[PDB]
């Protein structure tokens with residue numbers, strides 16, 4: 238279920254994300270590349286990247302736009318870490334286009350893991366981060382399952 242974060246945990250999340258927030262596009266490009274390189278089956282899910290060698294598409298605007306849009310959502314989630322309804326809305330709106338996409342929870346969770354590994358967080362910030370991410374996926378999966386209105 239959704240579990241609100243304390244004011245202290247909210248600060249921990251903001252601080253944990255700070256490095257990435259300060260280099261959002263750069264981080265996005267690297268993480269997305271590492272994600273598709275470690276879990277190559279996922280490249281085909283992105284119709285614009287499908288059929289090309291990963292090292293070939295990594296430098297294209299298209300690849301960068303995708304990585305950027307993904308991280309922009311996470312950035313806005315962190316922005317709303319202190320407002321559950323707002324946090325939920327960011328995810329609800331983004332969930333729509335994924336509902337009809339043939340993507341497994343494994344794929345989504347693997348991306349979560351690549352992001353976590355890149356942050357190298359200590360356990361205090363990690364706990365707060367995982368609380369926010371658990372909320373992220375609770376909302377995201379509820380929405381993919383057709384139960385997004387509960388957050389309205």
Ligand code: HEM
Nearest residue numbers: 279282283284285306307310311331334335340344345348
């Ligand atoms: C859970 C973290 C994710 C976030 C925050 C996120 C966010 C977004 C956003 C904002 C868009 C653009 C609007 C649209 O839906 O067209 C998008 C598009 C898309 N996403 Fe995600 N996404 C995530 C994970 C994934 C995963 C794990 C996959 C599958 C490997 C995936 C596949 C796609 C595809 C195929 C598109 C559209 C293709 C395109 O625009 O060229 N996404 N995503």
